[PDB]
Structures are given as structure tokens and as C-alpha cells.
Design a binder for this molecule. Structure first.
Ligand code: AOH
Ligand code: AOH
Ligand code: GBF
Ligand code: GBF
Ligand code: GBF
Ligand code: GBF
Ligand code: GBF
Ligand code: GBF
Ligand code: GBF
Ligand code: GBF
Ligand SMILES: CC(C)=C/C=C/C(C)=C/C=C/C(C)=C/C=C/C=C(C)/C=C/C=C(\C)CCC=C(C)C
Ligand code: SF4
Lengths: 600, 25, 600, 25
């Protein structure tokens, strides 16, 4: 009964029946096919016959055409045939998705989520097998620049060839075939798993969380597995192939990993989004358990019912998370700040900042386990990212364990937080904004920038030993780091290691933005900065001011006879609306700015 | 991509985005 | 009874008696003398014998020594004698300021503010006359680089000479002497003025507001009156004189107005601060009138008692202010955005942004009245500043007229806002934060950045026709503007007109910061940016989150035996504290960044 | 302006500024 299990604003908008959910899934497949058809045809460039495919997302999808062994010229007959067939598919899916199918519904009443998962195992088995067979007999782009059937081999431990990569797919087909049969007969009834059949939000949460972990493995694989046809190196090769437009080629020659790093940034960002949103759903499911006095006799066996009321567990556990953030942040940002002060003042002959030593630490544990040879850049960057992860987890674990009662609600005499969405409780006790579950969701989104930004600066080849460029007295440290980066870090395939800390790198990249794409990424930066600034007006403690001022603007529009425009100021966005929209736009406008950096 | 084409299409983006706040307010 | 007339937090801190107020004034004079003594001796440079005076504020005070005809070498015998005598004065003033003087108090019970103003007229008369006489007989720096007595002349309409500038001071002495005598006998009892004797906050408000207007006249005079000894040109001359250290000289040769523009930025910023704080005091005085049912029988004659309750006056008046902001902002930022898009995309040969026309409008009204010959840079900059002023006035006029009742309080069924300092009323009606008088004070401080920033970018020679640098197709417009700027704009004495809009100018100035003062202004930028970011944690709708999380941090410190440090998290800053501190630091850290721009 | 002088004086600024929030909290 989903309409009873969502926040108020969504009760009238959430698919409310088995059938409606299936229709939403169908229409979502229509969206997928439709995006493919749109982006092969539109948003390529101003003049594709001469400029090729220059614009983002289209470049990545044309890089796929290239990897498939098709003519990846802008608007080629292959590209158009692919785009038009996906449009056909989209229209058929949306068609079915917007008509009611009572027989389909009647059957869905008999389907369990365990059964659906069996079916998904064997659908995935089909896809994996058929794609292995397509590779095997019809081929993909081969080393000779021609479409080449891969053959089929199952020598898992021999060298990677097209044939064994085909075998890898067929093997996954077999594995999911046997696994689907096994679970068809045995079910998922084991304890600690039977409860999933009870609640769609629990299943949904787990899907999001595991998908987030898949995203992270994909980020790392896109850096490490750079084979030009069987890995993500097809994005390097496409950008300098015969199909690449002149400007894309010029950019890729000084930035070989250009398109790979755009894909990486997309998967980093989406992965963070599914991690935090998935945890929000699991926490919301738990909170509904805790608010349904009925929903307790089946879940009493789980420890979280107790932990969500135990103030000593809450403090010990959250304190451990905060320590896990504090220590690596202190080490990484403290070192990089000392080194920054040293780089800044290196020309000084006297005074407080003259003749500072550079802090230079390697990464012996990572090197011993994975075969890198890291420098202070990796040491600082990895501790800043690790710290950002634990930092982000502070609001995440509060969603999970603080959203019904906390030491604070007990301290101030409350029985329990009323629900998961209330924005505040007013000025009592010096102010109470954003103790609810959803407000900690937003805060985790905000904090997640401490993961995304250092990760991006690292991946794009910033010097992460310092916030500014390495000064001349410390050049030896940079040069040694550059040698072992080139010889031992797979990232050197995508990015040269510059001597520029992020602040200096911003100057250089932004300067380069004036002269690529006719300057457009400067327009992107400026517009994104404006919108980001405006979110302050929605996120600051100033909503009442705006609601009061909005009455003057509405009144003024009515006086002159344009009340249809004054309706824009019928009221200010509410606390809840302004926090949701402000967080969304604050977060995404930051990502737009980083996307500019990914375009040059 | 003449001046009239370009102003027209700019105004199209403007009118379109301007309706986003109406959905909430 | 000031303790009854201030916000709660200040009742125990405000000087509570006539005598205590006088002592505070004495101690403030001690602060003035002490700053002079400190800054002539410390914070000059790391090694003054070789580097001279390099650091801000000290440079401005040494430029004064220079203008006085004294040896303005760092730590010269003249500088030390001046510094040590001002220290003596500070110690004597603080000495007297921290002892009780009962006879002085008994006499103060007999002093009125009208009497004090008579006395101030004749003290100012003394200062003006004695300084004219010092100039006349002992002199200031003369055109020959020597101290030269000016003589004394009263030829007001002849050419400005040192002698007539001395006469100007003596004449001001005479005028304030006659004016003090006149008011000694006639008083200030005229209607609409008698009420000032009633309330110290009304007098205080007016002093701040008029001082703000003086600040603005000083900003303009520092640009326009650039005479090298009798005007603010002494700051240009000092920076390239024999006393100037080598680096100050190198900077001034490419930036002649360096020190003048530092003084300008100081007076712009302080003037805005006194304007808004002065209006806050006047509004607070009015609000106390409206809250004292007694305080009405003497003020009923004033129209503001009515206006503060009249919802049609409130909407008409505030709507007029908003229009006065909207129209010039729309014109200035809309034009500059079109021109920005044109400059950005100027290299494009096709597509939506190719071959745009530059919007080019002059300033014929300003030219006809003041003798300028302005370009699109002046037209845009002046409308952006004018608009920023009306924008800032929106929260200012709400302080004055919305702080007891408003159309909003009537709409939601309230009788009246309880006081001037409450932070919010909670989530009712979609949220109520920052409708009080003090919260509109903060908002005016925030909004005032729309005055300060464009004014600074203009004064420092940014191209204000565009947010980026002028592109080659529009170079003719820049060159024509440069010719008439050089020949008709007095600002060219302080700043060359660059072709750089503020975004491009930021790149160039920040690049220059790496190589002046051993890079220190990069440290200033980075530290200021960090603090600015942190204010979000105090200004966002998130105070309850922090108070709840603070309990975990305090608990963790206590567990390990360092509860004296955990007291830092005894509680989060309250709504009221965090808004005051957040606004102060948001505002000042922005000013620090602009100060970096003023240093190069 | 030796390393020990400079670290000492940096720590002095640190300890000093650190007391500002105690005044409110
Ligand atoms: C970034 C750009 C920005 C803008 C363009 C505004 N605020 Mg906003 N604002 C901000 C921040 C960073 C903060 C943080 C939190 O301090 C706030 C807070 C806050 C609060 C608390 C309130 C009010 O209570 C009051 C109100 O009545 O809201 C209904 C209001 C108002 C209205 C004033 C009325 C008037 O002057 O209209 C006149 C309207 C203008 C002068 C804006 C005209 C703008 C253009 C023509 C477009 C320019 C476009 C480009 C350059 C691309 C007006 C629409 C407006 C514009 N703001 C408020 N604010 C940024 C901006
Ligand atoms: C700019 C830098 C910045 C920092 C360094 C923090 N926030 Mg803050 N914050 C910010 C913004 C921009 C916003 C906007 C509004 O979204 C917020 C909001 C918000 C809310 C709502 C809450 C909480 O409720 C929670 C809390 O419990 O507060 C008592 C909290 C916390 C604590 C998390 C606990 C932990 O991880 O400790 C671990 C502490 C750290 C990981 C910080 C260690 C820092 C250093 C060693 C110094 C680095 C120094 C240099 C590089 C010069 C922790 C002290 C902390 C650090 N913030 C919160 N915030 C910026 C920053
Ligand atoms: C999303 C995918 C998914 C999920 C949620 C589960 C869940 C489970 C739960 C119910 C238990 C394991 C409990 C535990 O490890 O703690 C169970 C299980 C098994 N699973 Mg799977 N499995 C899969 C995919 C697979 C894949 C498809 C495969 C093989 C290719 C298997 C082969 C097995 C296998 C053999 C067993 C078990 O013995 C065990 C069980 O008890 O079955 C009920 N399982 N599997
Ligand atoms: C790093 C932060 C993080 C956070 C805050 C959460 C939070 C949660 C909450 C919503 C519950 C129960 C947590 C529990 O009580 O633990 C106690 C604390 C510790 C064990 C430490 C939950 C959950 C799960 N999580 Mg995650 N998880 C993650 C990372 C992951 C990682 C990404 C993975 C896999 C790689 C998972 C796989 C699962 C999975 C399977 C489940 C569950 O079934 C359960 C859930 O959602 O209920 C429906 N989860 N997860
Ligand atoms: C802060 C400075 C200050 C203030 C608040 C006032 C206030 C006033 C008020 C009480 C009225 C004018 C009412 C009005 O203009 O509307 C008054 C006034 C005058 N004032 Mg002044 N004056 C001064 C400085 C001066 C200066 C010192 C001078 C001369 C150098 C004067 C010469 C006069 C002058 C002649 C008159 C009047 O006739 C008029 C009055 O009615 O006196 C009570 N006044 N003066
Ligand atoms: C631009 C914005 C601005 C704002 C919002 C205020 C606000 C106020 C409020 C606090 C009151 C009464 C205003 C009134 O009801 O007007 C109605 C609206 C219009 C006239 C339009 C007041 C006030 C004064 N103001 Mg200002 N003033 C200024 C600019 C100025 C300028 C800077 C000047 C001189 C150049 C002054 C000189 C004075 C002065 C003398 C007084 C008063 O005696 C009075 C006060 O503070 O009471 C003690 N004031 N001023
Ligand atoms: C498979 C992914 C998935 C699914 C099925 C859901 C589903 C839901 C449902 C249960 C509710 C209500 C949504 C609503 O009614 O839709 C309405 C939308 C439609 C019906 C769309 C219909 C489409 C059209 C009309 C046409 C559009 C066509 C195009 C745009 C091309 C909801 C919800 C939330 N979700 Mg998630 N979420 C996710 C991923 C996420 C991601 C991971 C994130 C964040 C990064 C979140 C953060 C939140 C968040 C915060 C909330 C809410 O408050 C809300 C809630 O109440 O949860 C308790 N959620 N989430
Ligand atoms: C400001 C909003 C914003 C921003 C900056 C981003 C950024 C990105 C980047 C990080 C990547 C790679 C580039 C690309 O394919 O973009 C595509 C961008 C859009 C489809 C929409 C962008 C929005 C606007 C142009 C309108 C903005 C309007 C305002 C800000 C008022 C990406 C991406 C995707 N994103 Mg989003 N997205 C959004 C909004 C959305 C909206 C909310 C939606 C669906 C309703 C999506 C669905 C997807 C989707 C499917 C993909 C990808 O394949 C790709 C990826 O890398 O995944 C791993 N995305 N997304
Ligand atoms: C001559 C200038 C002047 C004077 C006398 C006052 C006086 C006051 C008094 C009436 C109260 C309470 C202050 C307190 O008790 O002090 C305590 C401080 C001392 C006693 C200082 C003692 C000094 C030491 C112990 C040693 C320090 C030595 C050094 C720092 C070297 C107060 C006040 C405010 N003021 Mg103003 N203000 C100003 C200028 C301004 C400026 C223009 C601004 C803003 C830019 C403001 C914005 C505010 C604002 C917002 C408020 C308040 O809320 C508060 C109030 O209640 O008003 C209604 N105010 N203001
Ligand atoms: C971050 C805080 C900050 C910033 C950025 C500024 C900036 C300025 C600039 C715009 C000018 C010229 C440069 C200078 O002389 O500075 C001097 C700076 C200080 C005296 C104090 C700076 C503060 C710190 C170094 C400590 C910051 C600590 C934290 C941010 C935690 C100026 C200035 C002055 N300011 Mg301030 N001030 C302050 C705080 C203060 C504090 C609150 C005080 C007194 C308690 C003053 C009293 C004065 C005063 C007297 C003057 C001037 O003569 C001059 C001016 O141009 O007036 C027209 N100022 N002030
Ligand atoms: C306007 C004008 C003319 C001048 C304006 C000047 C201004 C505003 C000056 C502001 C000066 C300020 C705030 C100085 C702050 C110093 C803080 C220190 C020394 C902290 C050290 C922390 C340590 C070592 C721990 C380890 C460090 C880390 C973990 C990062
Ligand atoms: S400031 Fe706003 S969000 Fe915070 S308690 Fe008050 S009304 Fe609620």
C-alpha cells in the first residue's frame, strides 16, 4: 500500500498498485531507449558534417558505436539506423506503458519479488549469452580497425583475448542460468532474508546500495582496464580516430583520457547518489517499522529496533564514524595546508614562512598490495577521500539510527521525532532545524562533495600534495613522483601528473575553457555559479523574510494588471520545498562546474 | 542561426524554465 | 536607562550610566591613539631596514607622515617620536578611562545632548583653526619635497594654493565658532528636533547615518581630489618616493593608485556599515516607541507611528523600493550578460551565439552635468551600483516599517511581532525565519555586497561592459572607451581601464598575487574562503542537526578525559548567535578577498 | 624566524583563535 508508505507530497504521485508499478517500469525502459535515439541525432555539434560529434553525452555514445565496429561518423547510416530503431522501441514501450492491461494486472497479483528475482537471473543469463555469441560470430571492433568476430574461448587464466572475453560472457550466462534454476526450487526463505518479501522499500533500498558499490567498481575499472577494444580504452581511441571531429581530436591529443574521465565523473556522481538515496530508503523502511506498533512482532529478532532506542550505542557508534573522518581529514588537509603555505611563500628569504620543509610521505601499504608506487599526492588524496567518505557517513548513520529517538530528543524532553520529513520544531532550546531523517539525507548529499571533489582533482592529474602548484625549491619531489606515476600508476593513461594543486589547476583549466568549444564552458560556469548562489536564498534561515516580501511582489504585479505573473510570488517556497530544491541545485550546480573541468 | 532564429530560441528556453517555480509555488 | 533599551544579550554589557558612557568614550579615544602608535612600529614588513613599509594599514599611515613633511622612512626618529607620544596619550586616556570619577559624574547629570553638541562645535572650531595655523606657519610637505609653511590666504575663488587651503581650515574654525555661539543661546528646541534630547539612540542613529554620507563623499573625493600635497595624491607620491621600499615602488609603478584605492575600499566598506547600522538603531528606537504605550503621547505628531501600522503604505512604499532595484539591475545585468555571451562566443562561426552585436550605450546625463565622457562600462556599472543600493534598501526599509506589524503578520493572524531580536516562530505557515528587525539588519549587510563589489571592480579599472574580457571583434568599442576614460575620467589617475570584465580580472589579479609579498595574498584568499564556507554551517537551516551532533563530540571528548576541550561542543551556537556571527564573518571574509585585490 | 620560533608563534595564533567560540558556546 505504497500510498500510505511515502511522504505526504508523494502519496498522490507514487504508483499505487502492482499494475501501475509495472507500467512505470515499462515507461522507464521507454526513457532509456529514447535517450539513446535522441543523443545519436541531436546535440552533436552546430555543424556535424564539418565538426563531427563534439558535445557531451553524445561523444560517449558515438565512442560506443566505434567500439561496436560500426561507422561512427556523425549521423552515419549506422548511427541513424540504431537511433531510429531505439525510437521505435521507445514508442512501443511508452505505448504499452500508458494503456491499462487488466490481464497483466491479474497475473501480477500472483507474482512475488522472489519469483521476479528468479526471472531476472534468467533474463540476465539470456543477455549475457547472446552478447557473447554476438561478439563470437559477428564481432566488435578489432585491433586492425575493422569489425572482427572474436571467436569463443574458455581459457580463463590464459591471456585476455577477444575470444576469452566472449567466453566470459557465455560463462556468466551459464552461472546465472544455474543460479536461477537453483533459486527457482529453493527460494529465498532463509532467515534474515524472508522479510524482504514483506516490503518493497527494503528490496529497493538494497538494490540502490549494491548498485552504488557496482558504480564504485566501475569507476576503478575505467581507470585500470584501459584495453583499447575489450576495455574502456575505446574512449581514448575514438577521440583520435578517423571519426573524431577536428576539435575533439585536438583536445584529446593534450588530454588522452578526456572521454574516459567524463564517463568516470558520471559514474562517481551517480554512484554517490544511489548510495545515499539507497540508505535513505532503508532508513525510511526502518522508521516505518519503528512507527508501526504492529510491525514489531516479526522484526524483534533484528538488533536495529534496540539500537534505534539505545543512546549509548548511538553515541559510541556515531563517535566511531566521526573519528574515522577526523583523523584522515586532519592528516590529509593538515599536511596539504602546511605544504601549501610552503609552496606559496617559497620565494621569501626571511619571516615566519621562509624555508619550510615539504612534507613528503609515500603509500607503502597500497604499493605492497596493488603494485603502485605512490607519492605524497596519493597519500594526501587517498586520506582526504577516505575522510570524506566517513564524513559523509555521519549524516547517513544518523538517518539510520537517530531518526526516531536520539540523545538530543531525550535531553530536551521529547518522546520521539514525529516523522521522517518535518523540517524543524522552532526556536525552542536555541533552534531545532533539520533533525529529521530527510534533512540528514540532504546533509549527506552536501557532505558527499568531500568525496567527489578530491576524487575528481586526483583523477584529472592535480598535484594533491598541495593546494597550489609546487614551487621550485620542491621540484625534485614532484619529478620523482612523476617518474613513478608514469611507470606505476595506470591513471597516467588518462591524465599526466601536473605540478598543480587544485587552486592553480582551476586557473589553468578555466583559462583553457576560453578557447575550447568557442568558450562555452565559461558560460556554463557563470550560469551555474549564479544558480548556486541563489540556492542560499532557499537554504539560509530566511524563509519567513521571503514569504513576507513575496506579498509585496504579488501585490505589485496585481496593481498593474499582471496577476498571472505575480502568482510566482503567491508564497515563498516552504522550508521543506526550499531545502529539497536548494540541496538538489547546490549539489548539481557544483557538478556542472566540475563537468566543465571534465570537458577541457 | 540568424539573429531572429537565435533570439526566438533563447526566448523559448526562457519561457520554458520560467514555469518551473509555478509547479511548487 | 540603556540597560532596559538594548537586546537581552547586551543588558549586562552596555554602559549603564552617564559616567560609564563617558568612560567608554575616553577609552575609545585611547584605542584611537593606541592604533596609531602600534601601526607606526609593528606590522611594517619582515625587515624594514631593507624592505621599507610594505604591509597594509601601515603603508597608509606612513603615507601620512610623508604628507606631513616628516621623515617617512620606516622606523625613523620622526615616526618613533610620533608613535611613542600617541602611546603615552593612549595610556593616559585608558588610565583615566578605567578609574571612577564621582565629581565628573555629578557634573554629567547636568549635561544635555544639546549642550554637548554646542561644546563639540567649538572643539571642532579649535581643531580646524589650530590646524590651519600649523599649516600656515610650520607647514606640510611642499611641491619641492621639503616641508614648507603654507602661508594663509582667504581668496576662496582664486586657484587652490597651500595658503588658501590653510584659509579654508581657519574659515571652518570661524564658522563653527559662530554656529556654536548661536546655538549656545538658541538651543535645538525647534519642533521635529526637541525629541532628540529624549533618546540617546535617536541621536546615535543620526550620527551614524550622516557619518555614512560623509564616508560616501570621502570615497568620491579620494578619486577626484588627487592633488599631490593638498589632496589624496599624497598616497600616489609616497608609494614612489625615496621613502618607499623597493617592492611597494615596483607595485605602484604598474598600479599608481594602489594605496589610494586601499583607503577608498576601507571608507566604502565602513560607510556602508555605518549606513546600515545607523538605520538599524533608528528603527530600533522607533520600535521602542511603538512598544512603549506611554511613549506615544509625545510622538503621535510623527507620521511613522501611523505608517508602521498601515498595510497599504507598507506595500506601496516597499514596492517602490523594489522597482528602484529591479529596473536598473535588469538593465545593467541584462546588458552585461548579453555582452558577456557575445565576448565568450566571439570566435564561433555558426550556432546560436555567433555574430552577436555588442550593446554600446554612453552616459549622456552624467557627462552633461559633471564633464565625464563615459562608455558602456560606466553606464552598466552605475546602474548596477544604483540598483544594488535600492536592493540593499529593501531590508533597510523593512527594519523601519515592518518590524512591529506587516501585511504578513496580519495575513497569518498575529497581533504583532514580539520584539526586534527573535530569530523565527517555527514551521507554521511553511516557515517563519528572519522576520524580525535584527534579521533584516543582517540581510541588508548581505545585500550590500551588490553595492561594494561592482563599485570595487569599477574603481580598480575592470571593464564593466561585460563579465569577461572584451573579444577582438569588439576592440574598437574598448579603444574608444579607453581614449575618453584617459582624457575625461579622473579615475585614470588611480587605475588604467583594462579590457577585463571582473571574471577575467580575477584570473589576472590572482595570478599576480603569487608573485607579490612572497605570495601571501594567496594565503589570505585561501583562509578567507575556508571561513566563508564554514559560515554556511551557521547560516543554513541546520541548527538542530548541529546541536544533536554536538552531544556526540562532547561525549567523546569526555570519554577520553579531555572534557575541557569537549566544552567547545557543550551546545551548538543558537539561531541568534549563529546568524550574527555567520553574517559578520560572511561579510568580512568577502571583504578580505577584495582586500587581496586591493593589495596588487 | 627559525623553525622553532615560527612553529611556536603559529601555535600561539592557534591557541588564541581557538578560544573565540568558547565565549559563545
Ligand atoms: C543570486 C542572486 C539573487 C537575486 C537575483 C536575488 N537574491 Mg534574494 N538572496 C540571495 C542570496 C545569496 C540570499 C542569501 C540567503 O542571503 C538571498 C536571500 C533573500 C531573502 C532572505 C529575501 C527577501 O526576503 C526578498 C524577497 O522578498 O523574496 C521573495 C528577497 C529577494 C528579492 C528582493 C526584492 C527586490 O529587490 O526585487 C527586485 C529584484 C531584483 C533586484 C532582482 C532582479 C534580477 C535580475 C533582473 C536577474 C539577474 C540575472 C543574472 C545576472 C543572470 C529579489 C527577488 C531577490 C533577488 N531576492 C530575498 N533574498 C541572492 C539573490
Ligand atoms: C568548511 C568546512 C567544514 C568543516 C571542517 C566542517 N563542516 Mg559542518 N558544515 C559545513 C557546511 C558548508 C555546511 C552546510 C550548512 O551544509 C555544514 C553543515 C553542518 C551540519 C548541519 C552539521 C552537523 O550536524 C555536524 C555536527 O555535529 O556539528 C556539531 C557537522 C560538522 C561536524 C561533523 C562531525 C565529524 O565529522 O567530525 C569530524 C570532523 C572533521 C572531519 C573536520 C576536521 C577538520 C579539520 C581537521 C580542519 C581542516 C582545516 C583546513 C583545511 C584549513 C564537523 C565538525 C564539521 C566540519 N561539520 C555539521 N556541519 C562545512 C564544514
Ligand atoms: C541478488 C542476488 C542473490 C541474492 C539476494 C541471493 C540470496 C541468497 C540467500 C537467500 C542465501 C545466502 C545467505 C547468505 O549468504 O548469508 C542464498 C543461498 C544461495 N545462493 Mg543466492 N542470492 C543471489 C544470487 C545467487 C546467484 C544467482 C547464485 C548462483 C549463480 C546463487 C547461489 C546460491 C546457493 C548454492 C545458495 C545457498 O545454499 C543459499 C541458500 O540457503 O538458498 C536458499 N545465489 N542466496
Ligand atoms: C557505508 C555506509 C552504509 C550505510 C550507512 C548503510 C546503511 C544501511 C541501513 C539502511 C541498513 C542496516 C544497516 C545496519 O543496521 O548495520 C549495522 C552496522 C554495521 C553492520 C556496521 C542497511 C542494509 C544493507 N546494506 Mg547498507 N549501508 C552502507 C553500505 C553498504 C555497502 C554499500 C553494502 C554492500 C557493498 C551494503 C549492503 C546492505 C544490504 C544487503 C543491506 C540490508 O539488508 C540492510 C537493509 O537495507 O534493510 C532492508 N550496505 N544498510
Ligand atoms: C549637527 C549639527 C547641527 C544641527 C543638528 C542643527 C540643527 C538646527 C535645527 C534645530 C534648526 C534648523 C531646522 C531645519 O533646518 O529644518 C537649527 C537652526 C539653525 N542653525 Mg543649526 N544645526 C547644526 C549646525 C549648525 C552649524 C553649527 C550652524 C552655523 C555654522 C548652524 C546655524 C543655524 C541658524 C542661523 C539656525 C536657525 O535659525 C535654526 C533655528 O531655528 O535654531 C534653533 N547650525 N539648526
Ligand atoms: C537610504 C536609506 C535610508 C533609510 C532606510 C533611512 C532610515 C531612517 C529611519 C531610521 C528614520 C526615519 C525615516 C523616515 O521615516 O522616512 C520617511 C520616508 C521618506 C522621507 C522617503 C531615519 C531618520 C533620519 N535619517 Mg535616514 N534613512 C536613510 C538615508 C538617510 C541619508 C543617509 C540621510 C542623510 C544624508 C539621512 C538622515 C536622517 C536624519 C537627520 C534622520 C532622522 O531624524 C530620522 C531618525 O533616525 O529618527 C531618530 N537618512 N532614517
Ligand atoms: C530505482 C530508483 C528509485 C525509485 C523507484 C524510487 C522511488 C521512490 C518512491 C518510493 C518515493 C516517491 C517517489 C514518487 O512518488 O515519484 C513521483 C515521480 C513519478 C511518478 C515520475 C513519473 C514520470 C513522469 C510523469 C514523466 C517524466 C518523464 C521524463 C522525466 C522523461 C521516493 C521518495 C524519495 N526518493 Mg527514491 N527512488 C529511487 C532512487 C532515489 C535516488 C537514489 C534518490 C536520491 C539520489 C532518492 C531519494 C528520494 C527522497 C529524498 C525521496 C522522497 O521523499 C520520496 C519519498 O517519499 O520516499 C519516502 N530515491 N523514492
Ligand atoms: C543540473 C542537473 C544535472 C546535472 C548537472 C547532471 C550531470 C550528469 C553528469 C555528471 C553525467 C554525465 C553527463 C550526462 O550524460 O548528462 C545527462 C544530463 C541530463 C539527462 C539532464 C541534465 C539537465 C539539464 C540540462 C536541465 C537542468 C535544468 C536546471 C538546472 C533548472 C550525468 C548522466 C546522466 N544523468 Mg544527470 N545531471 C543532471 C540532471 C539529471 C536529471 C535530473 C536526470 C533525469 C531526470 C538525469 C539522468 C541522467 C542519465 C540517464 C545520465 C547519464 O547517462 C549520465 C551518466 O554519466 O550516468 C552514469 N540527470 N548526469
Ligand atoms: C558609535 C558607534 C556605535 C555605538 C556607540 C553603538 C552602540 C550600541 C549599543 C546601544 C548596543 C549594545 C552594544 C554593547 O552593549 O556593547 C558591548 C561592547 C562593549 C561594552 C565594548 C567594551 C570594550 C572592551 C571590554 C575592550 C575592547 C577593546 C578593544 C577591542 C581594543 C548596540 C547594539 C548593536 N549595534 Mg550598535 N553601536 C555603534 C555602531 C554600530 C555599527 C554602525 C553597527 C553595525 C555595522 C551596529 C549594529 C548593532 C547591532 C546589530 C546591535 C545589537 O544588537 C546591539 C543592541 O542591542 O542594539 C539594540 N552598531 N549598539
Ligand atoms: C575579518 C575582520 C575585518 C576585516 C576584513 C576588516 C577590514 C578593514 C578594511 C576594509 C579597512 C582597511 C584595512 C585596515 O585598516 O584594517 C584594520 C583591521 C583591523 C583593525 C582588524 C582586522 C581583524 C583581524 C586581523 C582579526 C580577524 C579575526 C577573525 C576573522 C576571526 C579596515 C579599517 C579598519 N577596521 Mg576593519 N576589518 C575587520 C575587523 C575590524 C574589527 C572588528 C575592528 C575593530 C574591533 C575593526 C576596526 C577598523 C579600524 C579602526 C579600521 C581602519 O582604520 C581601516 C579603515 O579603512 O577605515 C576607514 N575592523 N577594516
Ligand atoms: C584587512 C587587513 C588589512 C588584514 C586582515 C587580516 C586578517 C583577517 C587576518 C586573519 C588572521 C587569522 C584568522 C589567523 C589565523 C591563524 C590560525 C592558526 C595559525 C591556526 C593554526 C592551526 C594549526 C597549526 C593546526 C593544524 C592545521 C590544520 C589541520 C589546517
Ligand atoms: S530558523 Fe527556520 S528552520 Fe530553523 S527553527 Fe526557526 S523556522 Fe524552523
Amino acid at each position: 500500500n505504497p500510498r500510505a508508505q511515502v511522504f505526504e507530497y508523494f502519496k498522490l504521485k507514487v504508483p499505487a498498485t502492482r499494475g501501475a508499478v509495472l507500467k512505470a517500469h515499462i515507461n522507464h525502459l521507454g526513457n532509456v531507449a529514447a535517450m539513446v535515439s535522441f543523443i545519436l541525432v541531436h546535440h552533436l555539434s552546430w555543424d556535424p558534417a564539418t565538426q563531427g560529434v563534439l558535445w557531451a553525452p553524445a561523444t560517449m555514445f558515438y565512442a560506443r558505436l566505434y567500439q561496436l565496429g560500426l561507422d561512427a561518423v556523425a549521423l552515419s547510416p549506422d548511427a541513424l539506423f540504431v537511433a531510429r530503431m531505439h525510437l521505435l522501441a521507445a514508442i512501443i514501450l511508452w505505448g504499452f506503458g500508458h494503456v491499462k492491461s487488466p490481464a497483466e494486472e491479474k497475473f501480477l497479483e500472483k507474482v512475488t519479488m522472489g519469483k521476479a528475482l528468479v526471472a531476472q537471473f534468467h533474463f540476465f543469463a539470456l543477455i549475457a549469452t547472446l552478447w557473447g555469441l554476438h561478439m563470437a560470430f559477428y564481432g566488435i571492433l578489432g585491433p586492425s580497425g575493422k569489425l572482427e568476430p572474436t571467436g569463443l574461448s574458455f581459457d580463463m587464466f590464459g591471456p585476455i583475448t577477444p575470444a576469452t572475453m566472449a567466453g566470459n560472457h557465455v560463462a556468466f550466462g551459464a552461472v546465472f542460468f544455474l543460479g536461477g534454476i537453483f533459486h527457482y526450487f529453493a527460494g529465498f526463505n532463509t532467515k534474515r532474508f524472508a522479510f524482504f518479501e514483506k516490503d518493497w522499500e527494503a528490496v529497493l533500498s538494497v538494490s540502490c546500495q549494491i548498485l552504488a558499490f557496482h558504480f564504485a567498481t566501475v569507476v576503478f575499472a575505467m581507470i585500470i582496464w584501459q584495453h583499447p577494444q575489450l576495455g574502456f580504452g575505446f574512449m581514448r581511441e575514438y577521440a583520435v580516430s578517423q571519426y573524431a571531429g577536428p576539435e575533439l581530436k585536438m583536445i584529446a591529443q593534450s588530454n588522452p583520457g578526456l572521454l574516459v574521465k567524463q564517463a568516470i565523473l558520471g559514474h562517481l556522481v551517480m554512484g554517490i547518489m544511489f548510495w545515499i538515496g539507497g540508505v535513505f530508503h532503508g532508513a525510511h523502511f526502518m522508521l516505518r517499522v519503528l512507527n508501526d506498533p504492529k510491525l514489531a512482532e516479526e522484526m524483534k529478532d533484528f538488533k536495529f529496533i534496540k539500537r534505534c532506542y539505545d543512546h549509548e550505542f548511538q553515541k559510541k557508534f556515531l563517535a566511531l564514524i566521526m573519528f574515522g573522518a577526523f583523523l584522515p581529514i586532519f592528516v590529509s588537509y593538515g599536511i596539504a595546508t602546511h605544504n601549501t603555505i610552503a609552496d606559496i611563500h617559497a620565494a621569501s628569504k626571511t619571516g615566519l614562512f621562509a624555508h619550510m620543509t615539504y612534507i613528503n610521505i609515500g603509500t607503502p601499504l597500497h604499493d605492497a598490495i596493488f603494485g603502485s608506487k605512490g607519492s605524497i599526492s596519493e597519500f594526501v588524496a587517498a586520506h582526504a577521500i577516505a575522510g570524506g567518505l566517513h564524513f559523509t557517513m555521519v549524516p547517513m548513520w544518523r538517518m539510520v539510527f537517530f531518526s526516531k529517538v536520539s540523545p538530543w530528543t531525550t535531553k530536551v524532553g521529547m518522546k520521539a521525532k514525529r516523522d521522517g520529513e518535518f523540517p524543524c520544531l522552532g526556536p525552542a532550546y536555541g533552534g531545532t532545524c533539520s533533525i529529521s531523517l530527510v534533512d540528514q539525507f540532504y546533509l549527506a548529499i552536501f557532505f558527499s562533495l568531500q568525496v567527489i571533489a578530491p576524487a575528481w582533482f586526483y583523477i584529472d592529474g592535480c598535484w594533491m600534495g598541495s593546494f597550489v602548484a609546487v614551487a621550485a625549491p620542491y621540484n625534485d619531489i614532484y619529478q620523482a613522483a612523476l617518474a613513478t606515476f608514469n611507470s606505476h600508476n595506470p591513471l597516467h593513461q588518462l591524465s599526466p601528473l601536473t605540478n598543480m594543486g587544485y587552486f592553480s589547476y582551476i586557473i589553468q583549466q578555466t583559462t583553457a575553457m576560453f578557447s575550447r568549444y568557442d568558450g562555452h564552458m565559461i558560460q556554463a560556469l557563470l550560469g551555474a555559479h549564479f544558480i548556486w548562489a541563489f540556492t542560499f536564498s532557499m537554504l539560509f534561515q530566511y524563509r519567513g523574510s521571503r514569504d513576507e516580501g513575496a506579498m509585496v511582489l504579488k501585490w505589485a504585479h496585481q496593481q498593474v494588471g499582471v496577476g498571472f505573473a505575480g502568482k510566482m510570488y503567491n508564497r515563498a517556497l516552504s522550508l521543506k520545498e526550499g531545502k529539497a530544491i536548494g540541496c538538489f541545485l547546490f549539489f548539481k550546480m557544483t557538478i556542472v562546474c566540475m563537468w566543465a573541468l571534465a570537458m577541457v | 542561426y540568424s539573429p531572429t532564429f537565435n533570439v526566438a530560441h533563447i526566448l523559448a528556453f526562457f519561457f520554458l524554465f520560467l514555469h518551473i517555480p509555478f509547479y511548487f509555488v
